[PDB]
């Protein structure tokens, strides 16, 4: 510190001699020793740890620096003035968009609308802390992602889910960000940032068919993100920029969320046990798009679970039969149909885990939960047709086949509909055996299918579920008969004996049967034409090897700069198909063949969000298999060059931190499938039976071994960068697993990993100043 | 930790040398690094002479990690470097640590008597 | 039963900081073991070397430096002993042949490539030669009575009685690929999806049938999803290969319909036909983290064709490797009787390694344990011999051991 | 070269590029003779019977085309009438010894598939139109070269089968069958029927 002060005084005196003179190379040499001392990382670290013990000499340092800067800036040089500016910046030293927030928001919109907001707030705060993001640009990227995903949404229920996601889930996210962190000024700044983007907002307004920025600003006013004066001048600006009969979906959703709450509170009590009122309200629900609007609002606002509990309890109430005549039981069976079909539609759209009760004290699990558990096809669920669930009795099933062969029921006055729906599988099994032996004619098959599908539509769904399981098990030539059964069960309407609301139940049932049969009718080219409703389904090309799909989608995502919704779905199917290791390895290969700084940083900011499909398993593969294979192989580390290598080290440390601090249904199923012994994989010469701690301990042993060895190459630069962004990215812990020999070795190989880690007590300077020695 | 043969060789040195371990560079993973000294009526020019004694001492004779940065900028130091390097070249294979210390001392003495 | 020798690497073990990989092992008709191991010293190509060990002189281990950029999934000798197929993750099937007819110099000129897709099953095509051993005619004093050819047809006969040579591989996607080697140096490749519903194939296996049909079984590891089956028919339409697939009856697995505690054993870990050319029986191995179940199934007709279970073990340790026999016994009822009376047991055993040291030689038909060998660390790869009197095995260390079974 | 020598040898051979450039008849690939039946073959047109390459003096770095098999010259000579002895003098055939020369066999097959292509173009605009003349000359030439076992029948037929198919070459298959009939009718009694 004193020699730096003497050097500053030498530059001041030599520059004064230069001013009096006007070869004065003394200034050139003085500045050369300034930049040669201060250019080293050792010396600037030594001055920074020298700062603490000698306070107020730094003031004299900077005042001499200011006078030096004046006397040099008056007499500029073609080379020395730039040098003096550089040394001044050194002594003081002692954007673009943010694609990751974009793709995280678009991922949560596409995959789990029904996820809790706290997980999303935790993930977004994480991303804001990893790469240090200003708050206006952060909220701007949230709004831009939401609007872009709304515009790119396919028409149908996905447009409803995206309108509910922007207008109902994102304000709650910003509210919890306001809690968990001067937010109104920043969100107002971000709204002005957004209101500059007139083409985005006009594309959105053409899809919304209204001013959806007006509804946004009134909604953020209601939540309290924005002050009212801000809201009014923003709406004035938007109207001025805008100047150059059916309700739109946003008004329907924003008014339909209070109807979700009030429909909960009024149908707690079965309309004071008036089932005709229930029939009227539920018939209004099955009128076009009203169910979807309620479900999108309830999903975006966290109340889908209570909605499912309410319809399940209604179903349990209408399972059995009260003592009745005909026009009370013909109401009760319709209540069973409406509750069942809406529950199947919920379970097929928003996943099955909102239907589960998650704790049932006592054995009294409802009928629909067990039926969905053991009998309904989902995406990753294939069913055993001769599971014991599909073989309840032999007693009831003969009563049921006699019931279906009697006439049009007429005995609906007491049916115990759960028993009937559980027995249809065995019933149509015996019907199929009878038709395969030929004892039954095709015309009687038509009569039985009409008796099934006519009075109550849920029977067709239960039968088609068992038929789909049974056709999936069969061979190719043996299928031909059973597909005809689906053609009659899923055919157009049987008429003239319908109870009530028949066409709407037919419409919902045709959707459910589409999503049940689609896979089996993909295996053999069979068109049923039930009635787009499956917008992201069957996305892969039929014959092309799957790495070409992966590299093409990643090339297009890099050249755009953000991840689409369709690209998110194909990336999910490839992660499920080729497995985690293949996926993560091929994406990292496609990283490492980039040569530009800009494209490498963008690729990493996208790949973090792509790996957020299953972050935990991807981190285990990444820090356990990919990085030790790149660091240990002697031929591989030429790929660890400067431009891709810094980016890869950033991605590894972001993945490590986000996995430590701590998501799709395929990934949940597959990690429940997975068996591995991480104690055996990483023998290692907190818990330490948690595999991530084991991978991190193994990786830090590898890093210490690389830093300690001879033959410094690009891999040593890699582990330097990894430790430096471990230091910079942290708040304070991933570095709890670092071996203490790394503390010594890292400043043997050079710096910041000392000067940050020490926490700067008076004794802490002594250990700091000791470390900065050797090299 | 440190092999017994190195401990005995250290215990049986001439009091001119004050050998010690090296905690500065990356050690305790490969060879044993030593900065010893030169203390005698002779000259104490460049006391460290960092020596890396590998494991399995009765083989792979230890190598002196060269540091020409300090031995330059001075004629005496350049001369001692030249003569000690030539004397290491003339040293027989499988030399010991005491051999390097003695040839270092005698090379310094030769540089004294020459100039 | 007994341990002949244990061959270990010297100082080249202690793989550090990089985790293990699964190993391959292949015992040829001539006694040459081809196998890969996790050496992991100063290079990862030490996990991409294919060691050829002549079993009479094991000290002399040749080490082919295969140019496989990912880890070698499958090794497979010829129907003779003269070529070796090796396929890794990311495509790249290579066909190593001898150089100058030395068993120490291998070089591959021919190979296939389905880039990016990991090969998960690999097999040479069947050349139509199959013989059966009648143990009850052991004294019959003529070799025509003891060993008799069983009229098998080769997949893809070309202009004569002569089969084409070639391989068929099944990737981790739905893709299957067939490569046909001409008598000239030319090679024809064709890939085609197995079925239209493209899905994960995490485990796969290949058998052949009479009639020249390949039967390939796929599973996606979940053990609550069906083990699907496909019939593949190869042809040379015009001048190029042509693959015709057709779905067969799938099976589900018991221990999922157990209903007491069905959730355990959630991973199918080994799928194996009982022998290639014995396409009607299937051995499956479900496993949890600690325990496992093997099962045998059969296609037998009555739905005409339908997979019914033969037998299953009670509960085991976690099965780490499985070796099926190669001696083609005649398997009918009289020969079962005479091989039980005169205690001939070479063709009736599978070997099951476990995650403790033990190895169980267990019956083919009703999987009851015939013998037990305690290692006194587990076998990560096993292979029985062609006369099935000795089994070779690579451990969870560098150790390669040959056991003799009486 | 080996990765340790590298440039040190490769550049060295590149400095022998001008000497090879001196010793090359320029345009040698595109110079064609006039086929006379007289014999007394000029040794400029001799090819190597193993590989159809020009025989080159030395080990110099010659130009890249001189290492290719000269199929254009051999096809031009086989398309001429009465080029029977000249093809033997080119490929060193001797007729005291039968050899099954393979590159001759492949060139004859490719000549047949070229005739089949040019017959499938039209063949009907001009009745003579050089097509049936080509098929007659193919009959005579291929009879001689298969009859003395300089090429062989069944390898020729099955390679011909591999070239056709997919190609979809069907308009003058009767001519190809006629040429095959000339071989079979010429030599059915000498060979086994499995040929």
Tab-separated table of C-alpha atoms in Angstrom, chain C residues 69-245:
chain	number	residue	atom	x	y	z
C	69	UNK	CA	-16.965	-42.678	-28.503
C	70	UNK	CA	-19.485	-43.859	-25.951
C	71	UNK	CA	-19.629	-46.903	-23.756
C	72	UNK	CA	-19.780	-50.341	-25.337
C	73	UNK	CA	-23.203	-51.825	-24.757
C	74	UNK	CA	-23.041	-55.175	-26.528
C	75	UNK	CA	-20.439	-57.688	-27.661
C	76	UNK	CA	-21.380	-60.649	-29.788
C	77	UNK	CA	-19.354	-63.364	-31.424
C	78	UNK	CA	-20.245	-65.009	-34.687
C	79	UNK	CA	-21.978	-68.327	-35.187
C	80	UNK	CA	-18.424	-69.398	-35.849
C	81	UNK	CA	-15.794	-67.825	-33.696
C	82	UNK	CA	-14.258	-65.600	-36.287
C	83	UNK	CA	-15.929	-62.184	-36.084
C	84	UNK	CA	-16.997	-59.976	-33.211
C	85	UNK	CA	-19.782	-57.421	-33.275
C	86	UNK	CA	-19.529	-54.570	-30.842
C	87	UNK	CA	-22.026	-51.787	-30.454
C	88	UNK	CA	-22.050	-48.806	-28.143
C	89	UNK	CA	-24.388	-46.020	-27.241
C	90	UNK	CA	-24.854	-43.574	-30.152
C	91	UNK	CA	-25.143	-46.155	-32.899
C	92	UNK	CA	-21.879	-47.387	-34.370
C	93	UNK	CA	-21.937	-51.137	-34.713
C	94	UNK	CA	-18.456	-52.316	-35.669
C	95	UNK	CA	-17.621	-55.773	-36.987
C	96	UNK	CA	-14.118	-56.799	-35.961
C	97	UNK	CA	-12.400	-59.517	-37.964
C	98	UNK	CA	-8.977	-61.074	-37.520
C	99	UNK	CA	-5.962	-59.549	-39.196
C	100	UNK	CA	-3.785	-62.144	-40.984
C	101	UNK	CA	-5.704	-64.882	-39.114
C	102	UNK	CA	-4.056	-63.970	-35.822
C	103	UNK	CA	-6.161	-63.999	-32.687
C	104	UNK	CA	-4.091	-60.987	-31.558
C	105	UNK	CA	-4.877	-58.565	-34.326
C	106	UNK	CA	-8.388	-57.382	-34.902
C	107	UNK	CA	-9.593	-54.770	-37.312
C	108	UNK	CA	-13.067	-53.739	-38.382
C	109	UNK	CA	-13.785	-52.704	-41.934
C	110	UNK	CA	-17.567	-53.140	-41.844
C	111	UNK	CA	-20.126	-51.487	-39.635
C	112	UNK	CA	-23.466	-49.800	-39.298
C	113	UNK	CA	-24.422	-46.474	-37.770
C	114	UNK	CA	-27.723	-45.176	-36.426
C	115	UNK	CA	-26.317	-41.975	-35.004
C	116	UNK	CA	-27.292	-40.781	-31.566
C	117	UNK	CA	-29.558	-43.738	-30.743
C	118	UNK	CA	-28.064	-46.164	-28.205
C	119	UNK	CA	-28.000	-49.787	-29.353
C	120	UNK	CA	-29.701	-51.843	-26.677
C	121	UNK	CA	-29.823	-55.254	-28.356
C	122	UNK	CA	-27.587	-56.781	-30.977
C	123	UNK	CA	-27.507	-60.128	-32.711
C	124	UNK	CA	-26.054	-61.914	-35.668
C	125	UNK	CA	-28.565	-63.337	-38.064
C	126	UNK	CA	-29.287	-67.025	-37.855
C	127	UNK	CA	-27.660	-69.315	-40.392
C	128	UNK	CA	-30.156	-72.130	-40.107
C	129	UNK	CA	-27.926	-74.714	-38.464
C	130	UNK	CA	-29.352	-76.133	-35.258
C	131	UNK	CA	-28.669	-79.475	-33.646
C	132	UNK	CA	-30.193	-81.268	-30.683
C	133	UNK	CA	-28.498	-83.590	-28.215
C	134	UNK	CA	-30.260	-86.805	-27.235
C	135	UNK	CA	-28.740	-87.729	-23.882
C	136	UNK	CA	-30.753	-90.967	-23.695
C	137	UNK	CA	-28.854	-92.146	-26.779
C	138	UNK	CA	-25.425	-91.544	-25.222
C	139	UNK	CA	-24.419	-95.183	-25.660
C	140	UNK	CA	-26.009	-95.545	-29.085
C	141	UNK	CA	-22.580	-95.940	-30.807
C	142	UNK	CA	-23.399	-93.676	-33.784
C	143	UNK	CA	-23.083	-89.905	-33.847
C	144	UNK	CA	-26.175	-89.511	-36.000
C	145	UNK	CA	-28.270	-90.828	-33.135
C	146	UNK	CA	-26.667	-88.665	-30.473
C	147	UNK	CA	-26.645	-85.289	-32.231
C	148	UNK	CA	-29.212	-84.547	-34.886
C	149	UNK	CA	-30.061	-81.504	-36.951
C	150	UNK	CA	-33.501	-80.123	-36.318
C	151	UNK	CA	-34.565	-78.575	-39.673
C	152	UNK	CA	-34.301	-74.897	-38.878
C	153	UNK	CA	-34.659	-72.249	-41.456
C	154	UNK	CA	-32.280	-69.322	-41.824
C	155	UNK	CA	-33.594	-65.785	-41.918
C	156	UNK	CA	-32.950	-64.413	-45.420
C	157	UNK	CA	-31.795	-67.207	-47.721
C	158	UNK	CA	-30.267	-65.811	-50.913
C	159	UNK	CA	-30.284	-67.718	-54.218
C	160	UNK	CA	-29.533	-71.216	-53.055
C	161	UNK	CA	-29.601	-72.791	-49.673
C	162	UNK	CA	-27.103	-70.271	-48.456
C	163	UNK	CA	-28.006	-67.828	-45.678
C	164	UNK	CA	-26.814	-64.272	-45.710
C	165	UNK	CA	-24.725	-63.109	-42.793
C	166	UNK	CA	-25.670	-59.908	-41.068
C	167	UNK	CA	-26.851	-58.392	-37.867
C	168	UNK	CA	-29.948	-56.883	-36.388
C	169	UNK	CA	-29.832	-54.251	-33.688
C	170	UNK	CA	-32.531	-52.610	-31.612
C	171	UNK	CA	-32.062	-49.067	-30.371
C	172	UNK	CA	-33.353	-47.258	-27.305
C	173	UNK	CA	-35.934	-45.594	-29.474
C	174	UNK	CA	-38.268	-47.801	-31.381
C	175	UNK	CA	-35.812	-48.293	-34.203
C	176	UNK	CA	-34.591	-51.628	-35.501
C	177	UNK	CA	-31.829	-51.959	-38.075
C	178	UNK	CA	-30.636	-54.857	-40.201
C	179	UNK	CA	-27.342	-54.964	-42.021
C	180	UNK	CA	-26.678	-57.673	-44.568
C	181	UNK	CA	-23.147	-58.491	-45.648
C	182	UNK	CA	-22.817	-59.568	-49.247
C	183	UNK	CA	-20.306	-62.207	-50.332
C	184	UNK	CA	-18.598	-59.186	-51.828
C	185	UNK	CA	-17.546	-56.390	-49.477
C	186	UNK	CA	-20.870	-54.552	-49.853
C	187	UNK	CA	-23.223	-54.062	-46.896
C	188	UNK	CA	-26.932	-53.209	-47.017
C	189	UNK	CA	-28.518	-51.351	-44.122
C	190	UNK	CA	-32.116	-50.592	-43.331
C	191	UNK	CA	-33.763	-49.048	-40.292
C	192	UNK	CA	-37.458	-49.010	-39.515
C	193	UNK	CA	-39.501	-48.337	-36.419
C	194	UNK	CA	-40.813	-51.339	-34.563
C	195	UNK	CA	-44.387	-50.118	-34.265
C	196	UNK	CA	-46.122	-46.869	-35.113
C	197	UNK	CA	-46.435	-45.835	-31.473
C	198	UNK	CA	-42.831	-44.850	-30.991
C	199	UNK	CA	-41.773	-45.395	-27.417
C	200	UNK	CA	-38.932	-46.170	-25.086
C	201	UNK	CA	-37.138	-49.507	-25.381
C	202	UNK	CA	-34.987	-49.741	-22.283
C	203	UNK	CA	-34.394	-53.493	-22.465
C	204	UNK	CA	-34.591	-55.615	-25.556
C	205	UNK	CA	-33.824	-59.080	-26.767
C	206	UNK	CA	-33.770	-60.993	-30.027
C	207	UNK	CA	-34.684	-64.590	-30.770
C	208	UNK	CA	-35.304	-66.395	-34.016
C	209	UNK	CA	-37.967	-68.836	-35.114
C	210	UNK	CA	-38.436	-71.611	-37.562
C	211	UNK	CA	-39.698	-69.933	-40.677
C	212	UNK	CA	-37.075	-67.219	-40.731
C	213	UNK	CA	-38.730	-64.687	-38.456
C	214	UNK	CA	-36.943	-62.667	-35.829
C	215	UNK	CA	-38.858	-62.039	-32.625
C	216	UNK	CA	-37.761	-59.005	-30.671
C	217	UNK	CA	-38.965	-58.224	-27.164
C	218	UNK	CA	-39.004	-54.698	-25.806
C	219	UNK	CA	-39.484	-53.314	-22.338
C	220	UNK	CA	-39.197	-49.844	-20.919
C	221	UNK	CA	-37.956	-50.820	-17.481
C	222	UNK	CA	-41.022	-49.827	-15.536
C	223	UNK	CA	-42.219	-53.355	-14.561
C	224	UNK	CA	-45.848	-52.178	-14.506
C	225	UNK	CA	-45.909	-51.660	-18.276
C	226	UNK	CA	-46.156	-54.478	-20.800
C	227	UNK	CA	-43.242	-56.354	-22.273
C	228	UNK	CA	-44.145	-55.982	-25.918
C	229	UNK	CA	-43.193	-58.355	-28.719
C	230	UNK	CA	-42.633	-57.855	-32.412
C	231	UNK	CA	-42.168	-60.238	-35.311
C	232	UNK	CA	-39.639	-58.955	-37.827
C	233	UNK	CA	-39.282	-60.421	-41.303
C	234	UNK	CA	-36.267	-59.484	-43.405
C	235	UNK	CA	-36.310	-59.486	-47.183
C	236	UNK	CA	-34.105	-58.121	-50.002
C	237	UNK	CA	-36.827	-56.273	-51.999
C	238	UNK	CA	-35.274	-55.441	-55.450
C	239	UNK	CA	-31.652	-54.814	-54.251
C	240	UNK	CA	-32.081	-53.275	-50.744
C	241	UNK	CA	-33.065	-54.614	-47.303
C	242	UNK	CA	-36.702	-54.461	-46.269
C	243	UNK	CA	-38.059	-54.962	-42.769
C	244	UNK	CA	-41.624	-56.005	-42.010
C	245	UNK	CA	-42.742	-55.827	-38.392
